Structure 1
Amino acid sequence: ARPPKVQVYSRHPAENGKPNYLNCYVSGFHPPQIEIDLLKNGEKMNAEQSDLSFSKDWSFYLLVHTEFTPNAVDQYSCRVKHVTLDKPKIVKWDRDH
Protein backbone atom coordinates (compact mmCIF):
# COMPACT_ATOMS: atom_id res chain seq x y z
CA ALA A 1 0.00 0.00 0.00
CA ARG A 2 1.55 3.28 -1.11
CA PRO A 3 0.58 6.84 -0.23
CA PRO A 4 0.28 9.35 -3.07
CA LYS A 5 2.57 12.28 -3.94
CA VAL A 6 0.89 15.51 -5.01
CA GLN A 7 2.10 18.52 -6.94
CA VAL A 8 -0.18 21.48 -7.63
CA TYR A 9 0.74 23.98 -10.37
CA SER A 10 -0.58 25.99 -13.29
CA ARG A 11 0.11 24.91 -16.88
CA HIS A 12 1.59 28.35 -17.77
CA PRO A 13 3.42 31.02 -15.79
CA ALA A 14 0.78 32.57 -13.54
CA GLU A 15 -0.28 36.08 -14.55
CA ASN A 16 -3.16 37.88 -12.77
CA GLY A 17 -6.32 38.19 -14.89
CA LYS A 18 -5.02 36.00 -17.74
CA PRO A 19 -6.73 32.66 -18.34
CA ASN A 20 -4.67 29.60 -17.36
CA TYR A 21 -5.10 25.95 -16.44
CA LEU A 22 -4.70 24.52 -12.95
CA ASN A 23 -3.36 21.02 -12.55
CA CYS A 24 -3.13 18.61 -9.72
CA TYR A 25 -0.83 15.66 -10.37
CA VAL A 26 -1.24 12.76 -8.00
CA SER A 27 1.18 9.81 -8.42
CA GLY A 28 2.91 6.83 -6.67
CA PHE A 29 -0.25 5.44 -4.97
CA HIS A 30 -1.76 1.98 -4.40
CA PRO A 31 -4.39 0.91 -4.44
CA PRO A 32 -6.08 2.82 -7.36
CA GLN A 33 -9.24 4.13 -5.65
CA ILE A 34 -9.04 7.79 -4.82
CA GLU A 35 -10.81 11.13 -4.68
CA ILE A 36 -9.14 14.30 -5.92
CA ASP A 37 -10.86 17.68 -5.88
CA LEU A 38 -9.73 21.13 -6.87
CA LEU A 39 -10.82 23.95 -4.60
CA LYS A 40 -11.18 27.72 -5.04
CA ASN A 41 -11.45 29.04 -1.50
CA GLY A 42 -12.44 25.65 0.02
CA GLU A 43 -15.03 25.35 -2.73
CA LYS A 44 -14.99 22.25 -4.95
CA MET A 45 -14.24 23.19 -8.57
CA ASN A 46 -15.66 21.42 -11.58
CA ALA A 47 -12.55 19.72 -13.05
CA GLU A 48 -11.39 17.01 -15.53
CA GLN A 49 -9.51 13.86 -14.50
CA SER A 50 -7.25 11.81 -16.88
CA ASP A 51 -7.68 8.07 -17.60
CA LEU A 52 -6.28 6.03 -14.67
CA SER A 53 -2.75 4.73 -15.55
CA PHE A 54 0.39 3.69 -13.75
CA SER A 55 4.17 3.66 -13.74
CA LYS A 56 6.90 0.92 -13.98
CA ASP A 57 6.65 0.27 -10.19
CA TRP A 58 2.88 -0.43 -10.56
CA SER A 59 1.98 2.84 -8.77
CA PHE A 60 -0.89 4.74 -10.23
CA TYR A 61 -1.02 8.30 -11.44
CA LEU A 62 -3.69 10.83 -12.27
CA LEU A 63 -3.98 14.44 -13.48
CA VAL A 64 -6.94 16.48 -12.25
CA HIS A 65 -7.30 19.80 -14.13
CA THR A 66 -9.51 22.76 -14.95
CA GLU A 67 -9.33 26.16 -16.59
CA PHE A 68 -8.66 28.97 -14.16
CA THR A 69 -7.90 32.64 -13.63
CA PRO A 70 -5.53 33.52 -10.85
CA ASN A 71 -5.79 37.09 -9.57
CA ALA A 72 -4.44 38.85 -6.49
CA VAL A 73 -6.74 37.17 -3.90
CA ASP A 74 -8.21 33.89 -5.23
CA GLN A 75 -6.90 30.95 -3.20
CA TYR A 76 -6.72 27.49 -4.74
CA SER A 77 -5.91 24.00 -3.52
CA CYS A 78 -6.00 20.31 -4.33
CA ARG A 79 -7.64 17.87 -1.90
CA VAL A 80 -6.86 14.17 -1.96
CA LYS A 81 -8.26 11.26 0.06
CA HIS A 82 -6.91 7.71 -0.09
CA VAL A 83 -7.14 4.62 2.14
CA THR A 84 -3.46 5.07 3.01
CA LEU A 85 -4.18 8.47 4.64
CA ASP A 86 -6.11 8.66 7.92
CA LYS A 87 -7.09 12.18 6.94
CA PRO A 88 -7.51 14.21 3.71
CA LYS A 89 -4.36 15.63 2.23
CA ILE A 90 -4.37 19.20 1.02
CA VAL A 91 -1.73 21.00 -0.99
CA LYS A 92 -1.85 24.77 -1.67
CA TRP A 93 -1.27 26.32 -5.06
CA ASP A 94 1.31 29.05 -5.11
CA ARG A 95 2.40 30.61 -8.37
CA ASP A 96 6.16 30.31 -7.66
CA HIS A 97 6.12 26.50 -7.41
Structure 2
Amino acid sequence: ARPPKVQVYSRHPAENGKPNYLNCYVSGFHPPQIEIDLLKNGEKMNAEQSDLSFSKDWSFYLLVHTEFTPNAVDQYSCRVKHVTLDKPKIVKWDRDH
Protein backbone atom coordinates (compact mmCIF):
# COMPACT_ATOMS: atom_id res chain seq x y z
CA ALA A 1 0.00 0.00 0.00
CA ARG A 2 1.52 3.33 -1.28
CA PRO A 3 -0.09 6.75 -0.64
CA PRO A 4 -1.43 9.17 -3.25
CA LYS A 5 0.67 12.19 -4.22
CA VAL A 6 -1.63 15.17 -5.09
CA GLN A 7 -1.11 18.22 -7.36
CA VAL A 8 -3.82 20.98 -7.71
CA TYR A 9 -3.08 23.37 -10.63
CA SER A 10 -4.73 25.35 -13.49
CA ARG A 11 -4.22 24.43 -17.20
CA HIS A 12 -3.19 28.04 -18.11
CA PRO A 13 -1.61 30.56 -15.69
CA ALA A 14 -4.66 32.03 -13.86
CA GLU A 15 -6.04 35.58 -14.63
CA ASN A 16 -9.03 36.70 -12.41
CA GLY A 17 -12.24 36.65 -14.56
CA LYS A 18 -10.64 34.64 -17.50
CA PRO A 19 -12.07 31.11 -18.13
CA ASN A 20 -9.60 28.25 -17.34
CA TYR A 21 -9.52 24.57 -16.17
CA LEU A 22 -8.75 23.36 -12.64
CA ASN A 23 -6.95 19.96 -12.40
CA CYS A 24 -6.36 17.61 -9.45
CA TYR A 25 -3.68 14.99 -10.45
CA VAL A 26 -3.47 12.04 -7.98
CA SER A 27 -0.74 9.38 -8.52
CA GLY A 28 1.64 6.81 -6.98
CA PHE A 29 -1.27 5.20 -5.01
CA HIS A 30 -2.16 1.55 -4.35
CA PRO A 31 -4.70 0.04 -4.02
CA PRO A 32 -6.93 1.75 -6.67
CA GLN A 33 -10.03 2.47 -4.44
CA ILE A 34 -9.86 6.30 -3.77
CA GLU A 35 -12.17 9.39 -3.43
CA ILE A 36 -10.89 12.60 -5.20
CA ASP A 37 -13.06 15.76 -4.78
CA LEU A 38 -12.36 19.20 -6.33
CA LEU A 39 -13.73 21.70 -3.73
CA LYS A 40 -14.84 25.35 -4.23
CA ASN A 41 -14.99 27.20 -0.82
CA GLY A 42 -14.95 23.70 0.77
CA GLU A 43 -17.91 22.25 -1.31
CA LYS A 44 -17.67 19.35 -3.85
CA MET A 45 -17.70 20.52 -7.55
CA ASN A 46 -19.09 18.28 -10.38
CA ALA A 47 -15.73 17.40 -12.07
CA GLU A 48 -15.00 14.64 -14.66
CA GLN A 49 -12.56 11.86 -13.60
CA SER A 50 -10.17 10.23 -16.15
CA ASP A 51 -10.19 6.43 -16.70
CA LEU A 52 -8.16 4.46 -14.11
CA SER A 53 -4.63 3.87 -15.58
CA PHE A 54 -1.25 2.99 -14.00
CA SER A 55 2.53 3.54 -14.27
CA LYS A 56 5.52 1.22 -15.00
CA ASP A 57 5.69 0.55 -11.15
CA TRP A 58 1.92 -0.52 -11.05
CA SER A 59 0.95 2.58 -9.00
CA PHE A 60 -2.42 4.11 -10.14
CA TYR A 61 -3.10 7.67 -11.44
CA LEU A 62 -6.29 9.76 -11.94
CA LEU A 63 -7.01 13.29 -13.29
CA VAL A 64 -10.08 15.06 -11.78
CA HIS A 65 -10.85 18.23 -13.81
CA THR A 66 -13.58 20.85 -14.57
CA GLU A 67 -13.96 24.32 -16.16
CA PHE A 68 -13.70 27.25 -13.70
CA THR A 69 -13.09 31.02 -13.90
CA PRO A 70 -10.70 32.27 -11.20
CA ASN A 71 -11.61 35.45 -9.21
CA ALA A 72 -10.26 37.30 -6.09
CA VAL A 73 -12.92 35.74 -3.71
CA ASP A 74 -13.14 31.97 -4.57
CA GLN A 75 -10.93 29.35 -2.75
CA TYR A 76 -10.16 25.96 -4.45
CA SER A 77 -8.76 22.74 -2.97
CA CYS A 78 -8.60 18.97 -3.73
CA ARG A 79 -9.58 16.35 -1.08
CA VAL A 80 -8.27 12.74 -1.36
CA LYS A 81 -9.47 9.86 0.88
CA HIS A 82 -7.44 6.60 0.65
CA VAL A 83 -7.03 3.54 3.00
CA THR A 84 -3.37 4.76 3.33
CA LEU A 85 -4.44 8.12 4.95
CA ASP A 86 -5.84 8.41 8.55
CA LYS A 87 -7.45 11.79 7.63
CA PRO A 88 -8.36 13.16 4.16
CA LYS A 89 -5.49 14.91 2.25
CA ILE A 90 -6.46 18.51 1.31
CA VAL A 91 -4.13 20.46 -1.07
CA LYS A 92 -5.08 24.13 -1.64
CA TRP A 93 -4.80 25.58 -5.18
CA ASP A 94 -2.12 28.32 -5.36
CA ARG A 95 -2.07 29.93 -8.87
CA ASP A 96 1.78 30.13 -8.51
CA HIS A 97 2.30 27.05 -6.20
Displaced runs of 4+ in structure 1, greater than 4 A? none
Q: How far apart, CA to CA, are the structure 1 residues paired with 2:82 and 2:43?
A: 20
CA distance in 2, matches of 1:43, 1:87: 17
What is the distance in 1 between the residues matched to 2:4 and 2:47?
A: 19
Unaligned residue ranges in structure 2 (runs of 5+): none
SS at structure 1 position matched to 2:87: coil
Q: Which residue of 2 aligns with 1:55?
A: 55
2:90 match? 90
Residue 95 of structure 1 deviates from its aligned partner by 0.3
Distance 1:2 1:48 in 2: 24
Give the TM-score normalised by the residue count of structure 2. Answer: 0.99
Aligned to 2:34: 34
Unaligned runs of 5+ in 1: none
Number of residue pairs matched by the alignment = 97
Q: What is the identity percentage for the equivalent residue pairs of Structure 1 and Structure 2? A: 100
- Offset at residue 73 of structure 1 (A): 1.3
Cα displacement string for residues 27-58 of structure 1 (whole angstroms, at most 9, x for unaligned residues) = 00000000000000001100000000000000
CA distance in 2, matches of 1:45, 1:19: 16
